[PDB]
Structure 1
Amino acid sequence: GAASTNQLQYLQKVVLKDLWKHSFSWPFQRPVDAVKLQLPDYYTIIKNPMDLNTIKKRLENKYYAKASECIEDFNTMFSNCYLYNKPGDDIVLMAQALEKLFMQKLSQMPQE
């Protein structure tokens, strides 16, 4: 159908799916469980938490009106990781590799 429809479909069927399949996706597949991970300060520091499963559900639920809103959530997920953690941390390296894949898939976003 319309370009906007193809774009949101692309984000769900290709971008989200390929990120999930990537070996470094596992920390981003669920919301941070602060009790489990022993991180009382996580939701003190991160006020706009985001994860791939939340994105998945929103795409399934037709929550986003346009592709840009979904891309915002992906970017928020990466930004959260960069903000909370420190340079050189393994989690940051992982996020950077995942983000690179994200950018590559974005570069092929249909416009017609």
Structure 2
Amino acid sequence: MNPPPPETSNPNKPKRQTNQLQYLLRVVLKTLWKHQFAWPFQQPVDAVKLNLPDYYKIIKTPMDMGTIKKRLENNYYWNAQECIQDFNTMFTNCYIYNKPGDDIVLMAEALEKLFLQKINELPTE
């Protein structure tokens, strides 16, 4: 069964736009999105569709790039570090739910390397 997906708006949470957050959307997310391994990570895990009834029994902080994209578009984040933490949660969820050597883990490992490559240098404010 599926829990509600992570929020992408929250009226009482303070919003912010920075050069780094704009970069995280325009270059980091939108480039990763096009990678041949991006497809599993473009939407919340649908445990009913994918037949993973234990996914949310194991993963208590779900995250995916579709949620991240919507948060960036909505200026949901205060700073770039908050957004980077969501990417890191997404990758670690994959490693936690699975095991070394699985096809999905190989995909996450490749995407994490590309992600780190792109966040190594960010614009200045």
| TM bucket normalised to smaller | over 0.9
1:53 to 63, 66, 88: 66
The residue that corresponds to 1:84 in the other structure is 97
The residue that corresponds to 1:15 in the other structure is 28
User: Cα offset for 1:16?
Assistant: 0.2
1:99 to 97, 112, 117: 112
User: Cα offset for 1:58?
Assistant: 0.3
2:77 to 60, 64, 71: 64
The residue that corresponds to 2:43 in the other structure is 30
TM-score, normalised by the number of residues in structure 1: 0.94
| Percent of residue pairs bearing the same amino acid type | 76
The residue that corresponds to 2:9 in the other structure is none
In structure 2, distance between residues paired with 1:111 and 1:88: 38
Deviating 4+ runs (over 3 angstroms): none
5+ long unaligned stretches in structure 1: none
RMSD: 1.0
5+ long unaligned stretches in structure 2: 1-16
Aligned residues: 109
